Amino acid sequence: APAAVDWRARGAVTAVKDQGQCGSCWAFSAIGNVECQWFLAGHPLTNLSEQMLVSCDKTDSGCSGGLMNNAFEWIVQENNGAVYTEDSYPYASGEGISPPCTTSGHTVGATITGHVELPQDEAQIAAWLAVNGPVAVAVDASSWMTYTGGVMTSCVSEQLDHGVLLVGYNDSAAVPYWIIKNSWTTQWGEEGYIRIAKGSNQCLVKEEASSAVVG
Numbered sequence: 001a002p003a004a005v006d007w008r009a010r011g012a013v014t015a016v017k018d019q020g021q022c023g024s025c026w027a028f029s030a031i032g033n034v035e036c037q038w039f040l041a042g043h044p045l046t047n048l049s050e051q052m053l054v055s056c057d058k059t060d061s062g063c064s065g066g067l068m069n070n071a072f073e074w075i076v077q078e079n080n081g082a083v084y085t086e087d088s089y090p091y092a093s094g095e096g097i098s099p100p101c102t103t104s105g106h107t108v109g110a111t112i113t114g115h116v117e118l119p120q121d122e123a124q125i126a127a128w129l130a131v132n133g134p135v136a137v138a139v140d141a142s143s144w145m146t147y148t149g150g151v152m153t154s155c156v157s158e159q160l161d162h163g164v165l166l167v168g169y170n171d172s173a174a175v176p177y178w179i180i181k182n183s184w185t186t187q188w189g190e191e192g193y194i195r196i197a198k199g200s201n202q203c204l205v206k207e208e209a210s211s212a213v214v215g
């Protein structure tokens with residue numbers, strides 16, 4: 001409903017991270033979503049562990065890729081809904097190789113009970129995000145390597161190959177857009193973020209949206 005929503009402005013989003021040479025975008029998309037949902041459930045903003053998923057989630061393929069929905073399900077069904085803090089299970093896959101899963105010596109930072117899959121409709125996703133928070137979405141990021149700033153009004157929308165986080169939107173601007181948190185350091189794009197035109201399914205953004213459910 002609101003003309004514009006930016007969850008970073010409410011202090012619901014953690015800092016931009018770095019996945020390195022590991023194809024773990026699915027883990028950053030999933031965890032980034034859990035981080036926001038946890039804060040919105042009335043808990044302090046806590047950095048959670050992507051490494052936990054890359055190393056322990058065997059329903060996915062670590063640095064070779066995975067699905068945000070598989071990750072959410074794994075946390076609930078295999079790890080008792082637990083998500084470790086980042087400082088207790090630091091990221092160590094930046095070189096391209098994921099170390100073995102360690103089942104102890106970690107602290108639980110958040111817990112989830114399940115996940116929901118949003119409709120393939122940008123207006124419906126926006127309405128949900130405006131009230132419930134950031135959404136994990138898959139996009140075609142083949143055009144993203146050359147992105148340097150501004151609203152991307154033209155995006156190659158052919159095949160989903162990347163997982164990111166929708167943190168807001170603005171329908172009031174000249175060209176309405178989505179605000180997306182990426183995981184390629186703050187050196188890429190607009191300090192780690194990218195804005196794409198909203199309304200024409202740019203980069204296939206409405207195809208695979210979902211969010212974890214807390215408490």
Ligand SMILES: *[C@H](CS(=O)(=O)c1ccccc1)[C@H](CCc1ccccc1)NC(=O)[C@H](Cc1ccccc1)NC(=O)N1CCOCC1
Nearest residue numbers: 023024025026063064065066067138141142160161162163
């Ligand atoms: C992350 C992608 S990326 O940030 O590396 C990237 C690379 C180039 C352009 C744009 C983004 C990750 C990469 C997986 C990978 C690793 C090595 C070589 C090739 C590919 N992408 C995924 O993990 C995607 C995410 C996704 C989520 C939901 C729907 C569709 C895609 N998943 C994916 O690649 N796999 C799904 C599970 O089976 C393995 C393939």
